[PDB]
Design a binder for these strands. Sequence first.
RNA 1: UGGGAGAGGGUGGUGGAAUUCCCGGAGUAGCGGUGAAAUGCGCAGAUACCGGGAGGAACGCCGAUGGCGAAGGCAGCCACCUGGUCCACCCGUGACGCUGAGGCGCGAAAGCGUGGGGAGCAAACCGGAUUAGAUACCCGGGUAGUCCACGCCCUAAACGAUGCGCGCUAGGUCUCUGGGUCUCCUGGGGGCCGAAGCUAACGCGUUAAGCGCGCCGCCUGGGGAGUACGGCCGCAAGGC
Lengths: 100, 114, 68, 88
Amino acid sequence: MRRYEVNIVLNPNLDQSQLALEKEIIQRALENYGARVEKVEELGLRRLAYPIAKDPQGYFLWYQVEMPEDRVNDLARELRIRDNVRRVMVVKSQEPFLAN
Amino acid sequence: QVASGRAYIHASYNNTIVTITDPDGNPITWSSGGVIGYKGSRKGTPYAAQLAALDAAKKAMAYGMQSVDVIVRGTGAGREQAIRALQASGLQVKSIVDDTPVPHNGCRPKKKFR
Amino acid sequence: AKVKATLGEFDLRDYRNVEVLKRFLSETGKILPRRRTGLSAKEQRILAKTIKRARILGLLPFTEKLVR
Amino acid sequence: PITKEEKQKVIQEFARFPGDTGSTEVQVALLTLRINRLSEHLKVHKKDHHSHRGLLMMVGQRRRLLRYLQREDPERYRALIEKLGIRG
RNA sequence: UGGGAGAGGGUGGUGGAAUUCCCGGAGUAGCGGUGAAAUGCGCAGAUACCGGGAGGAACGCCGAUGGCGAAGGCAGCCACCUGGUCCACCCGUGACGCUGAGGCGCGAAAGCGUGGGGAGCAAACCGGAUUAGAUACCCGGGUAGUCCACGCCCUAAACGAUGCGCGCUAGGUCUCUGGGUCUCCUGGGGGCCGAAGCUAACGCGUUAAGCGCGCCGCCUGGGGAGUACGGCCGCAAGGC
Ligand SMILES: [Mg+2]
Ligand SMILES: [Mg+2]
Ligand SMILES: [Mg+2]
Ligand SMILES: [Mg+2]
Ligand SMILES: [Mg+2]
Ligand SMILES: [Mg+2]
Ligand SMILES: [Mg+2]
Ligand SMILES: [Mg+2]
Ligand SMILES: [Mg+2]
Ligand SMILES: [Mg+2]
Ligand SMILES: [Mg+2]
Ligand SMILES: [Mg+2]
Ligand SMILES: [Mg+2]
Ligand SMILES: [Mg+2]
Ligand SMILES: [Mg+2]
Ligand SMILES: [Mg+2]
Ligand SMILES: [Mg+2]
Ligand SMILES: [Mg+2]
Ligand SMILES: [Mg+2]
Ligand SMILES: [Mg+2]
Ligand SMILES: [Mg+2]
Ligand SMILES: [Mg+2]
Ligand SMILES: [Mg+2]
Ligand SMILES: [Mg+2]
Ligand SMILES: [Mg+2]
Ligand SMILES: [Mg+2]
Ligand SMILES: [Mg+2]
Ligand SMILES: [Mg+2]
Ligand SMILES: [Mg+2]
Ligand SMILES: [Mg+2]
Ligand SMILES: [Mg+2]
Ligand SMILES: [Mg+2]
Ligand SMILES: [Mg+2]
Ligand SMILES: [Mg+2]
């Protein structure tokens, strides 16, 4: 029962239908690993500083999830098997630290 | 043939090698300190680098090229001289860029470099 | 002429705020020291950790070629 | 880790009077909980020597507390070790 | 009970820079190396350049007179398991403490055993220079090893060359990290200068090498010698 932020970067040249298919697979993994969603952001297509899979752009997704700790390493692994998933990074949610 | 190319300058502490490439990086011609009749430590002098750059640029003009983008790798003695010789040889030098490869704490150096 | 000085309030742990975080990089894509920036030591530690996170995510660069 | 709930359950279980949090019995019980969990961790992480030093410190502290309790109240000492399964 | 900082430790993943190798392209007369060269490599097409692939090892900037740890030591990033420690509240127990001959555990590097791995580097080794000679310093190569798992070895300028605990004795200044009444005060670390005092002097000086108490270890001229013999430990090297 702890909070995490899940960042996913996918193929940028993926159509709407395949994008929704991969979204449903991501949701299926999330439910299969006991994660509860609290917020979702979809920033879309962004230009990367360096090529990833020889591709200069990436499609981004950002989920706020709550799950038991012991499954976190498993879920991420399931998220890395798909050939269209370029990057998966799961971090522990942290309170904002403010300058000035 | 092409009027736009790239100029790679590889200036080690022992020699300066200049290559002219097509916009796809395929070389057209090259010249070094040994191509002019220098051997040994004289290959590392700034004047040898100036001559090598002038020779490579002259061959490039003989091929019919007018502008080159300059890429410099290494910190040898003949670096600035070669760059300046390219600047004043008859070629339009649009930009100069530094691209010397440095590891992000990678392989163990040789003893002389430790 | 300090990066911290010429900015408003922002999260130091935010690893998606590319526009703000890129101000804390040199021309070649290197993290600035405390001299250039003006943050405290703890703030600099947080900034470095977030910059590395954003580098891994593919937003900020690892290195950029020096241009004269 | 050890959450507040199980710790409070132990504290209520072993306390003499309701407002008691620092008696010998409660300290021994909390040390035994920590020692059991740490030994379970070390059974898998064999090369975790730095944590094993802390385990040694805990065992020594519990030994001192048990010696004091036995020297000041043998009946309480025997009841506590019987309830905790310490002897061995 | 509520909070904090941290390269503290163990396990599983994965990011890019760079070296090397292989494939393809393009291209030619040398490259490399030094004080100067030579060995070497290269027209059987090297060096320099571009693209693709594979693999191993180490983590640039941040970064520090910084931080953590009992010591040895610890540095990309993410997740999990886990140790220590600090502050505030002044809540509970009620002297439950300190030290510690033996014992047990940990303990850099190198080294040893059985499997794996092997890019770079590199004891031994080969060659080139240098030199009176050069079993070296410099250069070109090169095997163990360096890496991983498990098991041994147990040493060091393992150093602050300063055992641990507690109390007392002017200050000033820099810094990390907490609390507050956030000018400033009050805790905990890390440095510099200095009261009194101490010291053979150098220097130390609230982080004592000052003033005291408790417990442990060690010394008694140099060499012979950390040697021999005996004993114990180790596969061996060798250790005590
Ligand atoms: Mg030379
Ligand atoms: Mg040949
Ligand atoms: Mg070739
Ligand atoms: Mg290989
Ligand atoms: Mg340590
Ligand atoms: Mg500790
Ligand atoms: Mg009280
Ligand atoms: Mg009473
Ligand atoms: Mg005492
Ligand atoms: Mg004794
Ligand atoms: Mg050892
Ligand atoms: Mg060492
Ligand atoms: Mg070793
Ligand atoms: Mg071995
Ligand atoms: Mg020799
Ligand atoms: Mg001679
Ligand atoms: Mg050699
Ligand atoms: Mg070699
Ligand atoms: Mg070898
Ligand atoms: Mg030491
Ligand atoms: Mg000593
Ligand atoms: Mg002494
Ligand atoms: Mg002692
Ligand atoms: Mg202090
Ligand atoms: Mg001070
Ligand atoms: Mg001082
Ligand atoms: Mg002093
Ligand atoms: Mg001082
Ligand atoms: Mg003395
Ligand atoms: Mg005497
Ligand atoms: Mg002996
Ligand atoms: Mg003997
Ligand atoms: Mg034996
Ligand atoms: Mg010896």
